[PDB]
Amino acid sequence: HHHHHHMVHITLDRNTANSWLIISKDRRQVRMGDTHQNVSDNKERFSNYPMVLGAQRFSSGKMYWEVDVTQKEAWDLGVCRDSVQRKGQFSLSPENGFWTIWLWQDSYEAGTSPQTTLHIQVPPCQIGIFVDYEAGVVSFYNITDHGSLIYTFSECVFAGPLRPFFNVGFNYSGGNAAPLKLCPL
Template sequence: MRDIEELCNMMDPLTVLQESDTGDLCDTEDGDDEDRERHEKLLHDAGGLNMAGISHTLRTLSDIILRVNVHIYEREAEDILLDVNTAHNYLHVSGDRKIASWSDRYQNRPKIPERFQGYLQALSSQSFSSGRHYWDVDVGGSDKWIVGMSYPSIDRKGLQSLIGWNNKSWGLVKKDKKYLVIHDGKGIHLPINIISNRIRIYLDYDAGRIVFYDLCDPIRYIRTFTTTFTEPLHAGVWVWDGGKMKICGGNQKM
């Protein structure tokens, strides 16, 4: 399954299939001639398909596989709470620590090293260093937003503190009615519109994956980050002027 996921993420899947003809297939045992012939026929038949058809098929497979993974491995959304000690002083955090909203009033919280000083952001109080987890964020109250994940060692001021604009965080961004994913300051614009107001973030820490979904009906896969994590991960949100975001989870069933 993971080999298929990697194939679905390739820019040129036909090239990958062709390369496999001189790679893994050459390692088969002498008694596997029939398997080799089937693989060769598959490669021959693939050569007659157009790239648009292959890419569409693989994207569909990727969508199905990633959605199935979530349903198999997770039963209940994580009960994510925002850490007020990380919240910017113009970011209001609700009493249940689920809603982050822009405020025109200075919150007068103490200036401590954990607090964001440049951007209206907050991290979760929970951190994850193993296992599979997911939660949802309602982004309907904000025209511009970032949702994602971050190491606790992220900077707290300057451009390097913005989620996704450093090598310690990963973000999904809505800006000017466009969407992108970003890590280490390198963004990839997404050729889609997010239909619903709710984003699902899925983390498989041990496999090194952060996956974003649009919770429309049916649920739609957006993008995957793949890496090797070196620190615990916190959920993170950034709110634009006048906006608010709500974290959903804790009593949600799949």
């Protein structure tokens, strides 16, 4: 792809994080802690899942960023509306304000309703995410496989400002402790 020139510097918003997440000093990495991280509760925190938002809000234009997922067994990545539900159980779908893909149990899927199987021959170590606000497009790229296309959501109805979205996943297995990292431009 040729989207690299729309690169934006994303940082994580601590205030939105699930209370078990540990965000690095530079706000560019996040991982699952083994306990509550001793923060107060607030209405912005995702309560049920190990999720966090980027600080940046997008309402126009073209945006691109990259995320490192090396050695993880489970994660979700994409964008979401600023006004998505934070508390309780919910599914990741465009109806609920999410445009995402995930890894789970050795398969990759797009967060449509119902979910869509992805066809990935080279497991990615870094994911590129492209958003075209005006066109209503969110696309995902396999940086490990020369930028090959993973998935395109088109005809998106964003219906609000967008924020970068992250889920580091649970670590019930002991094999999913590795962080999500925002990669340098």
